[PDB]
């Protein structure tokens, strides 16, 4: 009854000294010989203008040319970042949207927010305009993030402290991922599309298996709500951004944190994290109107992407890795090279 906690704590101690047992080195100690990246400045090549409210989430495409951005004004704008065009402007039934997603095939766009419904919109109608094809329902909280797996499966996260794996055609929850004691704020899909991590307000990020349906590892260390998460491009690490003004690079094989990214006179939380094509540069969107560009191995500020009036709220690095797209609450997206 009351003796379950006294052995849960010894299980926690077993986990913690198993992690400390295999921690004979650290990432910062062995990267003292690799050459520093210097100063990496990037100029705003394109300024995607046309929103009329705070942009909350954006997602790139596999073709690395189009993108989708969702704003508070109830608009999902599907752009064309090469020519700064507006291919589509989907109106939402609910203007309260906190997350958006572009399918890896490029034929579907997901959005969701305070309406607690994940709306899957079909872009290839083959008849006419873009209309809603699926309204996935079953959450009891705000939809915080959603990544497509393919055209028939989606992974979502909600403010009822659960993630879910949905079949689009049947419209049901194929799988439910529980274990979080706080609200999940962001999930990142592995490049091998078999695992995915999710960070929650209980200052922890959990790693889940999509096919089976249970948690494998639970990484702690943060001191506040994790707002952002992103897999390292090889699929064997991931970075988390939190409200305690730090980023952290957790490893799935060492099962512990390797590196912390922080600096003095930085007190604002991280809204977004993303990695480059090779993962050498870690891009972190902040609330101090800046997007810091850290070195993922040296833990030093390589660059800074300033130019947003309001809080940076979403980041995106292309599949071919050429550009960085930064959304913000001042209704502007910016493309950087």
């Amino acid at each position: 009854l009351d003796q379950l906690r006294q052995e849960a704590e010894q299980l926690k101690n077993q986990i913690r000294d198993a992690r400390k047992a295999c921690a004979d080195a650290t990432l910062s100690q062995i990267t003292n010989n690799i050459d520093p990246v210097g100063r990496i400045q990037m100029r705003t090549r394109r300024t995607l203008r046309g929103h009329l409210a705070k942009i909350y989430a954006m997602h790139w495409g596999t073709d690395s040319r189009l993108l989708v951005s969702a704003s508070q004004d109830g608009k999902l704008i599907i752009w064309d970042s090469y020519t700064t065009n507006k291919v589509h402007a989907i109106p939402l039934r609910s203007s309260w949207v906190m997350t958006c997603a572009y399918a890896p095939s490029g034929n579907y766009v997901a959005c969701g927010g305070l309406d607690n419904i994940c709306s899957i919109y079909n872009l290839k109608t083959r008849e006419g305009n873009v209309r809603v094809s699926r309204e996935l329902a079953g959450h009891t909280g705000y939809l915080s993030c959603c990544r497509f797996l393919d055209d028939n499966q989606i992974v979502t996260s909600s403010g009822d402290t659960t993630c879910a794996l949905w079949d689009i055609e049947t419209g049901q929850q194929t799988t439910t991922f529980t274990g979080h004691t706080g609200d999940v704020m962001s999930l990142s899909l592995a490049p091998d599309t078999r695992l995915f991590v999710s960070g929650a307000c209980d200052a922890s990020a959990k790693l889940w298996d999509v096919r089976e349906g249970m948690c494998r590892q639970t990484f702690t260390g943060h001191e506040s709500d994790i707002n952002a998460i992103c897999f390292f491009p090889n699929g064997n690490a991931f970075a988390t951004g939190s409200d305690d003004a730090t980023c952290r690079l957790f490893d799935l094989r060492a099962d512990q944190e390797l590196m912390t990214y922080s600096h003095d006179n930085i007190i604002c939380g991280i809204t977004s994290v993303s990695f480059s094509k090779s993962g050498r540069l870690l891009l972190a969107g902040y609330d101090d109107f800046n997007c810091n560009v850290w070195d993922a191995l040296k833990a030093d500020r390589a660059g800074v992407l300033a130019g947003h009036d309001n809080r940076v709220s979403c980041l995106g690095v292309t599949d071919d890795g050429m550009a960085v797209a930064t959304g913000s609450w001042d209704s502007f997206l910016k493309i950087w090279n």
Binding site: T44, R49, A306, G307
Partner: protein, 287 residues
């Protein structure tokens, strides 16, 4: 005795004006902020002011010495730059007025001309028009070594009574009659549009900045008008009424010349007096 103890004030005013204009040109180049059309128009006004105030010591040399050893081309560019900053300042303020007209009074189509390419095109063609109307004073500037004194004022070809006052009339009617009337009627339209009905409950945060910008533009226009009207009306009454000379008339002329010239130094401290864009840069560099 009004020349030995008077050059220090002129030199201090001109160096403060050129320093302020140089600091204004410094804080718009290679910065992520400071890109909008009104701010690059303030850039153009500041560079015109810098060009005006850079020739203040070269003009004051002839007052503090009584001799002009500078050269033929040297006075060819100081009388031409004087018609530059007079003409293009009231036309920059004219384009500020039509920029605010197409923004507040006009609908959301204001996001169809606010792009900086059109603003740069407007600035370049405005300077082209100013230089096209100012090429006669490049053509007709020379220095005469008269026995009474030295002077390099503007001369005319075939004067009769067709070229000595038509220039003054054409300058007066195309510096205050033409652009100040459209500026005043534009602000009248702006005030009636803003204060005939209520205002929508929109993004106040992004509207208070717009209101502050409009207030700063109105203050700039008002200070320019009040500091450039007396010299022009004195020129008109000198060229038409032709009152007999007096000591206090000469004192009034020498005061109103400086009152006209002080706009170039009043503007950089004016639009930086109450504006959060320049204040934190000034506080960071002042340490």
């Amino acid at each position: 005795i009004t020349a030995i103890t008077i050059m220090a004030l002129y030199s201090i005013v001109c160096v403060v004006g050129l320093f302020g204009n140089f600091l204004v040109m410094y804080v718009i180049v290679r910065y992520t902020k400071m890109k909008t059309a009104t701010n690059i128009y303030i850039f153009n006004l500041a560079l015109a002011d810098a060009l005006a105030t850079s020739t203040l010591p070269f003009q004051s040399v002839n007052y503090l010495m009584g001799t002009w050893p500078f050269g033929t081309i040297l006075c060819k560019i100081v009388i031409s730059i004087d018609y530059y900053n007079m003409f293009t300042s009231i036309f920059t303020l004219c384009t500020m007025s039509v920029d605010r007209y197409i923004a507040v009074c006009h609908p959301v189509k204001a996001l169809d001309f606010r792009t900086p390419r059109n603003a740069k095109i407007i600035n370049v063609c405005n300077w082209i028009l100013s230089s096209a109307i100012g090429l006669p004073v490049m053509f007709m500037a020379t220095t005469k070594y008269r026995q009474g004194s030295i002077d390099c004022t503007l001369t005319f070809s075939h004067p009769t009574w067709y070229w000595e006052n038509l220039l003054k009339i054409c300058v007066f009617i195309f510096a205050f009659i033409m652009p100040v009337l459209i500026i005043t009627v534009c602000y009248g339209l702006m005030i009636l549009r803003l204060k005939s009905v209520r205002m929508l409950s929109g993004s106040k945060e992004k509207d208070r900045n717009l209101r502050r910008i409009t207030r700063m533009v109105l203050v700039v226009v008002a200070v320019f008008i009040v500091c450039w009207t007396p010299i022009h009306i004195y020129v008109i009454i000198k060229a038409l009424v032709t009152i007999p000379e007096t000591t206090f008339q000469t004192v009034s002329w020498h005061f109103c010349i400086a009152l006209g010239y002080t706009n170039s130094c009043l503007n950089p401290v004016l639009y930086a007096f109450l504006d959060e864009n320049f204040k934190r840069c000034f506080r960071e560099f002042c340490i």
